[PDB]
Amino acid sequence: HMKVMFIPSRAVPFNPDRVQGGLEAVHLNVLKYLVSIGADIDYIGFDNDTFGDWKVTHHPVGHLTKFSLGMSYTMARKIVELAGIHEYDFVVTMEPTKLTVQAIKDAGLSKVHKNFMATPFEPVSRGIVQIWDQTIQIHKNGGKSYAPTKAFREFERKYCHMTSALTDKIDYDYWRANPLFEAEDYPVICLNEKPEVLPATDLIISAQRYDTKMRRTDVALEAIKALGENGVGYCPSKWAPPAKYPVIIDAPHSEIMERLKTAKALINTCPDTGTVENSSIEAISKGVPVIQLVFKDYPHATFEYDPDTVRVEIDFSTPKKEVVALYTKAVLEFTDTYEARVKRAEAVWKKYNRDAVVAMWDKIFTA
Amino acid sequence: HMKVMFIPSRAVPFNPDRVQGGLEAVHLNVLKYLVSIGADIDYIGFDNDTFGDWKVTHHPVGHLTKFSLGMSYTMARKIVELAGIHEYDFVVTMEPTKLTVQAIKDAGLSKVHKNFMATPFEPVSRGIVQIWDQTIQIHKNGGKSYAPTKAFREFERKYCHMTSALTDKIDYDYWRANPLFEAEDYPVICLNEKPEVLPATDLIISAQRYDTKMRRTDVALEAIKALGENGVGYCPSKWAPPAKYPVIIDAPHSEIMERLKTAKALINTCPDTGTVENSSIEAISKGVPVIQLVFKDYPHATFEYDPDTVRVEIDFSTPKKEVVALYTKAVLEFTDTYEARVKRAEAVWKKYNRDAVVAMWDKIFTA
Ligand SMILES: O=c1ccn([C@@H]2O[C@H](COP(=O)(O)OP(=O)(O)O)[C@@H](O)[C@H]2O)c(=O)[nH]1
Numbered sequence: 001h002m003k004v005m006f007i008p009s010r011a012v013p014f015n016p017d018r019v020q021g022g023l024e025a026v027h028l029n030v031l032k033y034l035v036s037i038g039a040d041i042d043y044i045g046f047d048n049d050t051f052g053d054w055k056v057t058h059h060p061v062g063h064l065t066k067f068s069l070g071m072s073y074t075m076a077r078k079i080v081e082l083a084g085i086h087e088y089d090f091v092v093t094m095e096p097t098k099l100t101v102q103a104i105k106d107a108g109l110s111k112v113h114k115n116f117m118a119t120p121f122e123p124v125s126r127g128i129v130q131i132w133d134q135t136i137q138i139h140k141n142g143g144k145s146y147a148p149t150k151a152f153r154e155f156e157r158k159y160c161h162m163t164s165a166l167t168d169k170i171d172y173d174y175w176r177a178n179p180l181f182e183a184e185d186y187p188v189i190c191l192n193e194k195p196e197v198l199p200a201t202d203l204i205i206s207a208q209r210y211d212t213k214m215r216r217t218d219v220a221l222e223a224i225k226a227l228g229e230n231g232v233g234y235c236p237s238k239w240a241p242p243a244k245y246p247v248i249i250d251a252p253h254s255e256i257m258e259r260l261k262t263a264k265a266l267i268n269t270c271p272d273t274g275t276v277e278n279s280s281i282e283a284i285s286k287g288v289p290v291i292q293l294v295f296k297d298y299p300h301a302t303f304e305y306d307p308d309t310v311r312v313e314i315d316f317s318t319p320k321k322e323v324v325a326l327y328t329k330a331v332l333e334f335t336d337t338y339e340a341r342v343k344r345a346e347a348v349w350k351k352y353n354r355d356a357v358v359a360m361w362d363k364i365f366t367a
Numbered sequence: 368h369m370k371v372m373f374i375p376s377r378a379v380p381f382n383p384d385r386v387q388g389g390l391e392a393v394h395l396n397v398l399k400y401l402v403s404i405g406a407d408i409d410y411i412g413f414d415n416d417t418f419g420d421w422k423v424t425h426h427p428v429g430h431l432t433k434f435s436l437g438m439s440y441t442m443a444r445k446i447v448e449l450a451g452i453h454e455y456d457f458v459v460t461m462e463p464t465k466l467t468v469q470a471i472k473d474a475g476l477s478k479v480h481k482n483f484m485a486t487p488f489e490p491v492s493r494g495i496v497q498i499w500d501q502t503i504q505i506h507k508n509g510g511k512s513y514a515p516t517k518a519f520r521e522f523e524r525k526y527c528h529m530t531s532a533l534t535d536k537i538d539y540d541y542w543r544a545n546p547l548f549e550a551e552d553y554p555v556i557c558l559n560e561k562p563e564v565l566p567a568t569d570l571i572i573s574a575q576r577y578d579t580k581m582r583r584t585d586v587a588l589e590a591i592k593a594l595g596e597n598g599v600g601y602c603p604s605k606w607a608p609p610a611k612y613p614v615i616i617d618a619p620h621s622e623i624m625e626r627l628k629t630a631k632a633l634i635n636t637c638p639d640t641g642t643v644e645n646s647s648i649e650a651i652s653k654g655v656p657v658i659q660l661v662f663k664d665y666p667h668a669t670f671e672y673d674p675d676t677v678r679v680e681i682d683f684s685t686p687k688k689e690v691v692a693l694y695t696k697a698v699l700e701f702t703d704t705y706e707a708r709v710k711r712a713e714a715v716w717k718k719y720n721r722d723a724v725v726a727m728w729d730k731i732f733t734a
């Protein structure tokens with residue numbers, strides 16, 4: 001019934017069986033929903049996309065390895081073409097280029113533009129500055145952007161005061177006076193049936209990319225080593241750790257989730273950029289607590305999913321030597337009741353049950 | 368030309384190639400009939416339904432994984448909407464919710480309401496109590512409900528007097544004074560070609576789920592062991608027996624049926640809840656007799672399919688040790704003539720031949 005134009009993320013071709021974090025998770029979740037309600041989707045994507053049995057009218061702009069200029073102009077041209085022959089209820093985007101945003105405007109779709117975000121603002125990165133520059137442009141044009149969490153919305157009010165040598169073009173006057181995200185909640189997960197919380201083993205799991213700068217996974221896997229038999233780490237091969245930390249590489253996501261059901265806790269060591277944190281909600285939805293490394297006075301999505309989360313508190317000056325010891329101490333000394341597992345699973349059930357999720361989507365997809 | 372509103376079962380999305388029992392079988396068979404007579408069908412279903420080539424005007428209420436409250440209110444809203452624009456000859460229902468039944472009444476369709484049932488009354492189950500509560504409500508509102516067998520209608524006169532802590536809301540006064548089902552069966556089976564009754568081997572077959580509580584399959588497989596070479600058991604993997612009872616797991620249904628053609632008898636050990644009993648009619652339609660374990664003074668579908676069925680008679684207090692011995696004795700001592708095979712096959716052929724099945728449906732779908 002809904003007619004929708006869909007402009008995807010541009011890092012990798014779409015695959016429904018991919019499970020990772022970042023923008024790809026948002027991309028998948030929005031698309032999956034639209035397919036579930038039988039939307040007529042004009043998907044301006046890449047020749048190497050796959051959709052399985054999903055009904056999608058595909059408009060390829062080229063084979064994707066690295067997104068190119070030619071591809072972008074093909075995409076922009078296609079936007080305008082399609083908008084001429086079809087009446088779209090909405091156009092969906094995933095952190096689009098300047099050219100896409102301009103094309104949406106010229107096509108007359110700016111006021112039905114629904115944009116979704118995941119990448120934190122990082123002034124040092126030319127590419128990310130462009131992303132947020134266009135988030136500002138979308139707001140000026142009268143489109144709407146949506147954040148997965150309240151944490152991300154709080155971070156956005158910090159982002160407007162962050163500058164660098166690369167941010168001279170950014171309209172900070174406009175940004176500071178206009179919160180770029182809409183107030184409405186976004187369904188980061190969808191629970192169709194009320195979860196059956198299983199009792200804990202002693203096993204604690206880290207389901208994180210090996211990334212010392214962003215996620216401080218070295219700290220995580222140092223705690224894993226200290227746990228011995230009661231500790232396991234999962235890493236993708238694309239973000240594998242050094243040999244000194246044995247982990248399970250590229251495990252089927254389903255098997256990780258199945259194992260997580262009976263875990264005592266989840267290790268999460270991303271302190272400063274906890275904007276979405278999918279592995280946290282993956283755990284808490286099953287009743288599993290997160291042992292969260294975090295900066296003092298920083299927002300974090302984990303505390304949103306479970307207010308009672310255990311905090312291992314640091315700041316940017318805390319030496320690695322201390323951080324490891326302090327975090328390892330929290331992990332080895334971790335206790336948690338079965339009732340607390342039921343409680344935290346219930347809170348997430350109350351928020352992200354199917355009926356609540358559809359209501360959330362409805363508010364997003366309103367003209 | 369005939370205009371019908373169709374409210375489906377709610378456990379799984381509709382698939383025409385699904386070949387399970389229960390309410391889904393009734394759902395499929397009623398829909399298939401309506402399609403066969405070229406009915407104009409407004410189907411208030413789920414986005415993930417599929418219909419193949421069948422002509423159906425689909426009115427989705429959401430993607431179905433677990434039926435939700437939101438879906439139910441969407442469905443109820445759609446009922447009222449459609450009834451405002453269209454004059455329906457019938458509205459078809461599959462064990463509906465309170466909300467659906469109320470919606471049908473408010474829409475002014477209660478007197479053309481045709482409801483179909485399959486689930487036996489179980490006072491301990493909150494969900495099933497709701498189902499039968501609404502069966503009562505349909506009768507009060509002036510709709511009509513239909514049972515698979517005469518046995519099911521006899522069971523309904525026992526259901527009147529069954530209570531629990533969950534049945535305080537049930538209007539037992541009304542129920543006891545009003546048999547809920549109409550006199551016509553809905554056709555549980557359809558025989559397209561007359562079976563040619565083949566002479567018996569000595570082989571006796573149990574085609575039952577391993578379920579000691581409901582079907583007392585342990586008793587069955589104890590008789591199988593006593594038969595030795597002249598005994599075989601079939602079980603699905605979802606209801607497999609212990610190692611002590613060797614059986615054939617997840618055999619193609621067609622192979623079981625093919626084998627059954629030359630069997631001396633069929634073992635059926637469900638004494639209490641013989642409401643439909645598909646394996647009984649599967650056997651008797653091929654001329655194969657059933658050796659039926661049954662409670663004294665209890666109805667049973669087997670005796671409906673073949674009045675002359677041999678009864679192994681027990682009650683609830685009979686110890687398992689005795690029941691096994693008594694049933695094993697009946698199995699080993701079983702004799703049966705070829706003429707009796709022809710006779711029982713003929714009776715079932717007369718009742719459930721394709722043309723008779725159409726006639727059965729026709730009587731149900733009369734104003
Ligand atoms: O070996 C692994 C480790 C993680 N994950 C999944 O990858 C996602 C990681 O996303 P998250 O938001 O937790 O972190 P990010 O990678 O975006 O920093 C989660 O769904 C994890 O369960 C996975 O599939 N395999």
Ligand SMILES: O=c1ccn([C@@H]2O[C@H](COP(=O)(O)OP(=O)(O)O)[C@@H](O)[C@H]2O)c(=O)[nH]1
Nearest residue numbers: 388574575576601602603617620644645646
């Ligand atoms: O290994 C097996 C055992 C049984 N059945 C079929 O499953 C049904 C079981 O009988 P029925 O539905 O009467 O019993 P219920 O399972 O409902 O108690 C019949 O159609 C059997 O032929 C089957 O396909 N495979």
